[PDB]
Structure 1
Amino acid sequence: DVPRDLEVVAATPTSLLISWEHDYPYRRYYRITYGETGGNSPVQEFTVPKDVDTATISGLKPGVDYTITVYAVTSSYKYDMQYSPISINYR
């Protein structure tokens, strides 16, 4: 997980400040999800407007690998263009 396009800018023992680059102008807004890498926890999510490329993920747990994913939401139609998600694993 060496090069980046979604990255952790800042971090505390209970949080992560993430950042990413806009790549699909046909986006409506972004969807962020996060949960323990092992996937034994539920995966929490929130949305961000189209023009925002930064976020804070609070209340995390130390010594816990977290998989953070970001999606460029277009719509949810059977035939609308659906872009691939981008993610990283942290701590």
Structure 2
Amino acid sequence: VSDVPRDLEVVAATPTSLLISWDAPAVTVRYYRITYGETGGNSPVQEFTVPGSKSTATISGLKPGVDYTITVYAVTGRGDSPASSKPISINYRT
């Protein structure tokens, strides 16, 4: 049943750049929404949607040596029904 959020890990980092990768089942997923922000509360960093076509992603513009909270909102649907998914979030030091 539940199996949209999984395999979320970091492959490596680079000068002002990080590479995160998760999963994408075969169910025609409507779209994905990746949002991230450095712990602070001064202002959210950024977010971006994708047709679930990209299984990986390259994010940059962050600050090395700091806590970072990530949240992936996976929305699926068969046509237009209230098909609500199960979003998830986790904190990690990057």
What TM-score results when the alignment is normalised by the length of structure 2? 0.71
- Specify the code of the residue in structure 2 equivalent to 1:29: Y
Give the C-alpha shift of residue 87 in structure 1.
3.0
* RMSD (CA atoms): 2.4
Partner of 1:89: 91
Structure 1 unaligned spans of 5+: none
Give the C-alpha shift of residue 45 in structure 1.
0.2
Deviations 1:11-46 (A, max 9, x none): 125221110012472521110000013544314100
- Specify the code of the residue in structure 2 equivalent to 1:61: K
Partner of 1:15: 17
Matches within 5 A, 1:61-72: 61-72=63-74
Bigger Rg over Cα: 2
Deviations 1:45-67 (A, max 9, x none): 00122232111111100222111
Partner of 2:3: none
- Specify the code of the residue in structure 2 equivalent to 1:70: V
Partner of 1:46: 48
Q: 1:40 to 1:88 in 2, by over 3 A?
A: same
Partner of 1:36: 38
Q: 2:58 pairs with 56, 59, 80, which one?
A: 56
- Specify the code of the residue in structure 2 equivalent to 1:58: S
Q: Percent identity?
A: 77
Corresponding pairs, count: 86
- Specify the code of the residue in structure 2 equivalent to 1:5: D
